PDB file of all heavy atoms in Angstrom:
ATOM      1  N   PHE A   1     -26.962  -4.857  -1.861  1.00 57.16           N
ATOM      2  CA  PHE A   1     -25.824  -5.711  -2.252  1.00 57.16           C
ATOM      3  C   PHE A   1     -26.094  -7.131  -1.650  1.00 57.16           C
ATOM      4  O   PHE A   1     -25.862  -8.111  -2.388  1.00 57.16           O
ATOM      5  CB  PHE A   1     -24.527  -5.195  -1.553  1.00 57.16           C
ATOM      6  CG  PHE A   1     -24.129  -3.892  -2.140  1.00 57.16           C
ATOM      7  CD1 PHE A   1     -23.332  -3.042  -1.342  1.00 57.16           C
ATOM      8  CD2 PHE A   1     -24.457  -3.400  -3.376  1.00 57.16           C
ATOM      9  CE1 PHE A   1     -22.852  -1.812  -1.823  1.00 57.16           C
ATOM     10  CE2 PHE A   1     -23.963  -2.281  -3.923  1.00 57.16           C
ATOM     11  CZ  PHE A   1     -23.142  -1.401  -3.084  1.00 57.16           C
ATOM     12  N   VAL A   2     -26.625  -7.297  -0.435  1.00 60.98           N
ATOM     13  CA  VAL A   2     -26.929  -8.519   0.116  1.00 60.98           C
ATOM     14  C   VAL A   2     -27.992  -9.327  -0.559  1.00 60.98           C
ATOM     15  O   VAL A   2     -27.868 -10.542  -0.843  1.00 60.98           O
ATOM     16  CB  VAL A   2     -27.202  -8.465   1.687  1.00 60.98           C
ATOM     17  CG1 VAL A   2     -27.593  -9.783   2.248  1.00 60.98           C
ATOM     18  CG2 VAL A   2     -26.050  -7.870   2.429  1.00 60.98           C
ATOM     19  N   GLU A   3     -29.150  -8.644  -0.773  1.00 62.91           N
ATOM     20  CA  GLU A   3     -30.274  -9.319  -1.416  1.00 62.91           C
ATOM     21  C   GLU A   3     -30.025  -9.780  -2.884  1.00 62.91           C
ATOM     22  O   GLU A   3     -30.739 -10.675  -3.389  1.00 62.91           O
ATOM     23  CB  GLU A   3     -31.558  -8.441  -1.424  1.00 62.91           C
ATOM     24  CG  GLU A   3     -31.872  -8.058  -0.015  1.00 62.91           C
ATOM     25  CD  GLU A   3     -33.197  -7.262   0.128  1.00 62.91           C
ATOM     26  OE1 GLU A   3     -33.450  -6.398  -0.778  1.00 62.91           O
ATOM     27  OE2 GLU A   3     -34.025  -7.541   1.000  1.00 62.91           O
ATOM     28  N   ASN A   4     -29.090  -9.131  -3.489  1.00 65.32           N
ATOM     29  CA  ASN A   4     -28.761  -9.455  -4.939  1.00 65.32           C
ATOM     30  C   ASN A   4     -27.376 -10.023  -5.154  1.00 65.32           C
ATOM     31  O   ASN A   4     -26.852 -10.032  -6.313  1.00 65.32           O
ATOM     32  CB  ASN A   4     -28.939  -8.218  -5.810  1.00 65.32           C
ATOM     33  CG  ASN A   4     -30.381  -7.692  -5.807  1.00 65.32           C
ATOM     34  OD1 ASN A   4     -31.174  -8.316  -6.366  1.00 65.32           O
ATOM     35  ND2 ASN A   4     -30.538  -6.522  -5.144  1.00 65.32           N
ATOM     36  N   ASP A   5     -26.719 -10.446  -3.977  1.00 68.44           N
ATOM     37  CA  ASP A   5     -25.395 -10.938  -4.051  1.00 68.44           C
ATOM     38  C   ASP A   5     -24.387 -10.235  -4.927  1.00 68.44           C
ATOM     39  O   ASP A   5     -23.728 -10.770  -5.810  1.00 68.44           O
ATOM     40  CB  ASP A   5     -25.445 -12.529  -4.580  1.00 68.44           C
ATOM     41  CG  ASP A   5     -25.697 -13.463  -3.522  1.00 68.44           C
ATOM     42  OD1 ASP A   5     -26.844 -13.478  -2.954  1.00 68.44           O
ATOM     43  OD2 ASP A   5     -24.763 -14.264  -3.131  1.00 68.44           O
ATOM     44  N   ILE A   6     -24.367  -8.894  -4.650  1.00 68.52           N
ATOM     45  CA  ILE A   6     -23.359  -8.090  -5.321  1.00 68.52           C
ATOM     46  C   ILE A   6     -22.228  -7.698  -4.392  1.00 68.52           C
ATOM     47  O   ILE A   6     -22.494  -7.361  -3.214  1.00 68.52           O
ATOM     48  CB  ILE A   6     -24.097  -6.761  -5.759  1.00 68.52           C
ATOM     49  CG1 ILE A   6     -25.148  -7.112  -6.822  1.00 68.52           C
ATOM     50  CG2 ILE A   6     -23.062  -5.829  -6.451  1.00 68.52           C
ATOM     51  CD1 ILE A   6     -25.871  -5.881  -7.426  1.00 68.52           C
ATOM     52  N   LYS A   7     -21.031  -7.803  -4.847  1.00 71.24           N
ATOM     53  CA  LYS A   7     -19.842  -7.387  -3.981  1.00 71.24           C
ATOM     54  C   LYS A   7     -19.607  -5.925  -4.230  1.00 71.24           C
ATOM     55  O   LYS A   7     -18.537  -5.529  -4.704  1.00 71.24           O
ATOM     56  CB  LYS A   7     -18.647  -8.281  -4.407  1.00 71.24           C
ATOM     57  CG  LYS A   7     -18.769  -9.749  -4.237  1.00 71.24           C
ATOM     58  CD  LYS A   7     -17.496 -10.499  -4.323  1.00 71.24           C
ATOM     59  CE  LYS A   7     -17.623 -11.950  -3.940  1.00 71.24           C
ATOM     60  NZ  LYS A   7     -16.273 -12.671  -3.776  1.00 71.24           N
ATOM     61  N   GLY A   8     -20.555  -5.157  -3.769  1.00 70.57           N
ATOM     62  CA  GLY A   8     -20.427  -3.660  -3.873  1.00 70.57           C
ATOM     63  C   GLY A   8     -19.456  -3.023  -2.874  1.00 70.57           C
ATOM     64  O   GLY A   8     -18.866  -3.757  -2.072  1.00 70.57           O
ATOM     65  N   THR A   9     -19.359  -1.732  -2.830  1.00 72.23           N
ATOM     66  CA  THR A   9     -18.597  -1.000  -1.931  1.00 72.23           C
ATOM     67  C   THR A   9     -19.193   0.281  -1.472  1.00 72.23           C
ATOM     68  O   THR A   9     -19.940   0.924  -2.173  1.00 72.23           O
ATOM     69  CB  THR A   9     -17.107  -0.747  -2.489  1.00 72.23           C
ATOM     70  OG1 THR A   9     -16.370  -0.057  -1.516  1.00 72.23           O
ATOM     71  CG2 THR A   9     -17.204   0.123  -3.794  1.00 72.23           C
ATOM     72  N   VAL A  10     -18.961   0.625  -0.178  1.00 71.04           N
ATOM     73  CA  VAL A  10     -19.422   1.787   0.393  1.00 71.04           C
ATOM     74  C   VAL A  10     -18.188   2.649   0.903  1.00 71.04           C
ATOM     75  O   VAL A  10     -17.250   2.141   1.401  1.00 71.04           O
ATOM     76  CB  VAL A  10     -20.260   1.535   1.590  1.00 71.04           C
ATOM     77  CG1 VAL A  10     -20.693   2.829   2.328  1.00 71.04           C
ATOM     78  CG2 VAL A  10     -21.494   0.740   1.205  1.00 71.04           C
ATOM     79  N   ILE A  11     -18.236   3.910   0.498  1.00 69.47           N
ATOM     80  CA  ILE A  11     -17.199   4.872   0.947  1.00 69.47           C
ATOM     81  C   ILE A  11     -17.830   5.943   1.713  1.00 69.47           C
ATOM     82  O   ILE A  11     -18.725   6.562   1.210  1.00 69.47           O
ATOM     83  CB  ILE A  11     -16.463   5.506  -0.335  1.00 69.47           C
ATOM     84  CG1 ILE A  11     -15.748   4.307  -1.155  1.00 69.47           C
ATOM     85  CG2 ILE A  11     -15.470   6.505   0.123  1.00 69.47           C
ATOM     86  CD1 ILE A  11     -15.131   4.831  -2.385  1.00 69.47           C
ATOM     87  N   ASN A  12     -17.446   6.169   2.950  1.00 70.78           N
ATOM     88  CA  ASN A  12     -17.949   7.189   3.766  1.00 70.78           C
ATOM     89  C   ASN A  12     -16.971   8.379   3.890  1.00 70.78           C
ATOM     90  O   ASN A  12     -15.784   8.120   4.268  1.00 70.78           O
ATOM     91  CB  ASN A  12     -18.349   6.578   5.164  1.00 70.78           C
ATOM     92  CG  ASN A  12     -19.526   5.666   5.080  1.00 70.78           C
ATOM     93  OD1 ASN A  12     -20.488   6.055   4.468  1.00 70.78           O
ATOM     94  ND2 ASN A  12     -19.387   4.489   5.683  1.00 70.78           N
ATOM     95  N   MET A  13     -17.437   9.505   3.650  1.00 70.41           N
ATOM     96  CA  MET A  13     -16.520  10.734   3.784  1.00 70.41           C
ATOM     97  C   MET A  13     -16.386  11.141   5.294  1.00 70.41           C
ATOM     98  O   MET A  13     -17.275  11.595   5.906  1.00 70.41           O
ATOM     99  CB  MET A  13     -17.080  11.933   2.917  1.00 70.41           C
ATOM    100  CG  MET A  13     -16.063  12.960   2.615  1.00 70.41           C
ATOM    101  SD  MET A  13     -14.631  12.388   1.492  1.00 70.41           S
ATOM    102  CE  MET A  13     -15.372  11.028   0.692  1.00 70.41           C
ATOM    103  N   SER A  14     -15.157  11.059   5.802  1.00 70.01           N
ATOM    104  CA  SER A  14     -14.946  11.331   7.180  1.00 70.01           C
ATOM    105  C   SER A  14     -14.169  12.623   7.256  1.00 70.01           C
ATOM    106  O   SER A  14     -14.390  13.600   6.530  1.00 70.01           O
ATOM    107  CB  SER A  14     -14.144  10.239   7.878  1.00 70.01           C
ATOM    108  OG  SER A  14     -14.121  10.462   9.281  1.00 70.01           O
ATOM    109  N   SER A  15     -13.141  12.712   8.128  1.00 68.26           N
ATOM    110  CA  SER A  15     -12.335  13.895   8.245  1.00 68.26           C
ATOM    111  C   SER A  15     -11.232  13.609   9.158  1.00 68.26           C
ATOM    112  O   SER A  15     -11.179  12.565   9.949  1.00 68.26           O
ATOM    113  CB  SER A  15     -13.215  15.014   8.911  1.00 68.26           C
ATOM    114  OG  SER A  15     -12.442  15.981   9.568  1.00 68.26           O
ATOM    115  N   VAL A  16     -10.183  14.424   9.202  1.00 68.49           N
ATOM    116  CA  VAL A  16      -8.991  14.236  10.115  1.00 68.49           C
ATOM    117  C   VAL A  16      -9.605  14.354  11.508  1.00 68.49           C
ATOM    118  O   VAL A  16      -9.021  13.858  12.439  1.00 68.49           O
ATOM    119  CB  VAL A  16      -7.945  15.293  10.005  1.00 68.49           C
ATOM    120  CG1 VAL A  16      -7.243  15.102   8.553  1.00 68.49           C
ATOM    121  CG2 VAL A  16      -8.499  16.676  10.088  1.00 68.49           C
ATOM    122  N   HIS A  17     -10.829  14.946  11.628  1.00 68.47           N
ATOM    123  CA  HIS A  17     -11.416  15.063  12.967  1.00 68.47           C
ATOM    124  C   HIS A  17     -12.105  13.813  13.520  1.00 68.47           C
ATOM    125  O   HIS A  17     -12.867  13.906  14.441  1.00 68.47           O
ATOM    126  CB  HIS A  17     -12.297  16.236  12.957  1.00 68.47           C
ATOM    127  CG  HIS A  17     -11.454  17.574  12.978  1.00 68.47           C
ATOM    128  ND1 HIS A  17     -11.561  18.519  11.975  1.00 68.47           N
ATOM    129  CD2 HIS A  17     -10.526  18.019  13.871  1.00 68.47           C
ATOM    130  CE1 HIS A  17     -10.717  19.445  12.236  1.00 68.47           C
ATOM    131  NE2 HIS A  17     -10.109  19.156  13.390  1.00 68.47           N
ATOM    132  N   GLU A  18     -11.838  12.580  12.884  1.00 69.17           N
ATOM    133  CA  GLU A  18     -12.408  11.403  13.506  1.00 69.17           C
ATOM    134  C   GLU A  18     -11.271  10.952  14.449  1.00 69.17           C
ATOM    135  O   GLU A  18     -11.389   9.958  15.056  1.00 69.17           O
ATOM    136  CB  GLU A  18     -12.731  10.323  12.361  1.00 69.17           C
ATOM    137  CG  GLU A  18     -11.574   9.708  11.744  1.00 69.17           C
ATOM    138  CD  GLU A  18     -11.859   8.441  11.029  1.00 69.17           C
ATOM    139  OE1 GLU A  18     -12.829   8.400  10.283  1.00 69.17           O
ATOM    140  OE2 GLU A  18     -11.115   7.432  11.100  1.00 69.17           O
ATOM    141  N   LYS A  19     -10.119  11.716  14.342  1.00 70.61           N
ATOM    142  CA  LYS A  19      -9.000  11.433  15.091  1.00 70.61           C
ATOM    143  C   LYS A  19      -8.596  12.706  15.937  1.00 70.61           C
ATOM    144  O   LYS A  19      -8.194  12.569  17.111  1.00 70.61           O
ATOM    145  CB  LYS A  19      -7.842  10.983  14.220  1.00 70.61           C
ATOM    146  CG  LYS A  19      -6.603  10.426  14.866  1.00 70.61           C
ATOM    147  CD  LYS A  19      -5.610  10.001  13.882  1.00 70.61           C
ATOM    148  CE  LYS A  19      -4.310   9.410  14.535  1.00 70.61           C
ATOM    149  NZ  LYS A  19      -4.716   8.188  15.289  1.00 70.61           N
ATOM    150  N   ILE A  20      -8.504  13.836  15.256  1.00 68.58           N
ATOM    151  CA  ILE A  20      -8.072  15.131  15.859  1.00 68.58           C
ATOM    152  C   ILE A  20      -9.293  15.737  16.591  1.00 68.58           C
ATOM    153  O   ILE A  20     -10.320  16.026  15.935  1.00 68.58           O
ATOM    154  CB  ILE A  20      -7.515  16.098  14.935  1.00 68.58           C
ATOM    155  CG1 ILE A  20      -6.353  15.448  14.191  1.00 68.58           C
ATOM    156  CG2 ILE A  20      -7.133  17.382  15.532  1.00 68.58           C
ATOM    157  CD1 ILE A  20      -5.762  16.404  13.101  1.00 68.58           C
ATOM    158  N   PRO A  21      -9.244  15.967  17.956  1.00 66.14           N
ATOM    159  CA  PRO A  21     -10.306  16.658  18.552  1.00 66.14           C
ATOM    160  C   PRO A  21     -10.565  18.072  18.005  1.00 66.14           C
ATOM    161  O   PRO A  21      -9.697  18.657  17.412  1.00 66.14           O
ATOM    162  CB  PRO A  21      -9.741  16.808  20.029  1.00 66.14           C
ATOM    163  CG  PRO A  21      -8.773  15.611  20.129  1.00 66.14           C
ATOM    164  CD  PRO A  21      -8.102  15.682  18.799  1.00 66.14           C
ATOM    165  N   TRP A  22     -11.812  18.655  18.201  1.00 64.87           N
ATOM    166  CA  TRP A  22     -12.074  19.892  17.641  1.00 64.87           C
ATOM    167  C   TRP A  22     -12.926  20.790  18.383  1.00 64.87           C
ATOM    168  O   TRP A  22     -14.197  20.863  18.260  1.00 64.87           O
ATOM    169  CB  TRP A  22     -12.739  19.694  16.240  1.00 64.87           C
ATOM    170  CG  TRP A  22     -12.491  20.795  15.244  1.00 64.87           C
ATOM    171  CD1 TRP A  22     -11.653  21.883  15.350  1.00 64.87           C
ATOM    172  CD2 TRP A  22     -13.201  20.996  13.969  1.00 64.87           C
ATOM    173  NE1 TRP A  22     -11.669  22.645  14.261  1.00 64.87           N
ATOM    174  CE2 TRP A  22     -12.631  22.185  13.410  1.00 64.87           C
ATOM    175  CE3 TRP A  22     -14.111  20.252  13.288  1.00 64.87           C
ATOM    176  CZ2 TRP A  22     -13.034  22.618  12.206  1.00 64.87           C
ATOM    177  CZ3 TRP A  22     -14.607  20.795  12.018  1.00 64.87           C
ATOM    178  CH2 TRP A  22     -14.004  21.939  11.500  1.00 64.87           C
ATOM    179  N   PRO A  23     -12.309  21.615  19.333  1.00 59.84           N
ATOM    180  CA  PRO A  23     -13.068  22.535  20.157  1.00 59.84           C
ATOM    181  C   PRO A  23     -13.929  23.456  19.276  1.00 59.84           C
ATOM    182  O   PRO A  23     -13.526  23.759  18.229  1.00 59.84           O
ATOM    183  CB  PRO A  23     -11.969  23.366  20.864  1.00 59.84           C
ATOM    184  CG  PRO A  23     -10.856  22.347  20.969  1.00 59.84           C
ATOM    185  CD  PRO A  23     -10.870  21.671  19.615  1.00 59.84           C
ATOM    186  N   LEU A  24     -15.137  23.730  19.797  1.00 56.97           N
ATOM    187  CA  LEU A  24     -16.097  24.601  19.056  1.00 56.97           C
ATOM    188  C   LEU A  24     -16.964  23.787  18.093  1.00 56.97           C
ATOM    189  O   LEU A  24     -17.938  24.202  17.604  1.00 56.97           O
ATOM    190  CB  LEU A  24     -15.419  25.812  18.371  1.00 56.97           C
ATOM    191  CG  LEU A  24     -15.356  27.095  19.023  1.00 56.97           C
ATOM    192  CD1 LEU A  24     -15.082  26.924  20.524  1.00 56.97           C
ATOM    193  CD2 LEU A  24     -14.232  27.990  18.432  1.00 56.97           C
ATOM    194  N   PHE A  25     -16.451  22.549  17.706  1.00 56.52           N
ATOM    195  CA  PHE A  25     -17.174  21.683  16.861  1.00 56.52           C
ATOM    196  C   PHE A  25     -17.282  20.246  17.462  1.00 56.52           C
ATOM    197  O   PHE A  25     -17.034  19.257  16.858  1.00 56.52           O
ATOM    198  CB  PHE A  25     -16.407  21.538  15.500  1.00 56.52           C
ATOM    199  CG  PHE A  25     -16.314  22.836  14.707  1.00 56.52           C
ATOM    200  CD1 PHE A  25     -15.197  23.713  15.030  1.00 56.52           C
ATOM    201  CD2 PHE A  25     -17.212  23.247  13.783  1.00 56.52           C
ATOM    202  CE1 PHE A  25     -15.066  24.884  14.240  1.00 56.52           C
ATOM    203  CE2 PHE A  25     -17.103  24.374  12.986  1.00 56.52           C
ATOM    204  CZ  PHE A  25     -15.930  25.198  13.341  1.00 56.52           C
ATOM    205  N   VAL A  26     -17.745  20.258  18.722  1.00 54.60           N
ATOM    206  CA  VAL A  26     -17.897  18.946  19.409  1.00 54.60           C
ATOM    207  C   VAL A  26     -18.782  17.961  18.739  1.00 54.60           C
ATOM    208  O   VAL A  26     -18.604  16.822  18.717  1.00 54.60           O
ATOM    209  CB  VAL A  26     -18.238  19.057  20.891  1.00 54.60           C
ATOM    210  CG1 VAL A  26     -19.649  19.587  21.037  1.00 54.60           C
ATOM    211  CG2 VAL A  26     -17.985  17.858  21.679  1.00 54.60           C
TER     212      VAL A  26
END
């Protein structure tokens, strides 16, 4: 995007667990 001056977009798939703690899945 930078080298070609494109106003692109990035979407990253997260989870409620970027906020809610998750025992067994630290």
Side-chain angles (χ1 to χ4, degrees):
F1 294 155
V2 177
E3 303 184 319
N4 297 290
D5 275 68
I6 297 182
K7 298 193 172 192
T9 180
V10 175
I11 296 175
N12 290 310
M13 199 65 26
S14 190
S15 158
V16 292
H17 288 118
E18 68 165 46
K19 187 178 186 64
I20 300 177
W22 207 12
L24 268 37
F25 298 87
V26 71

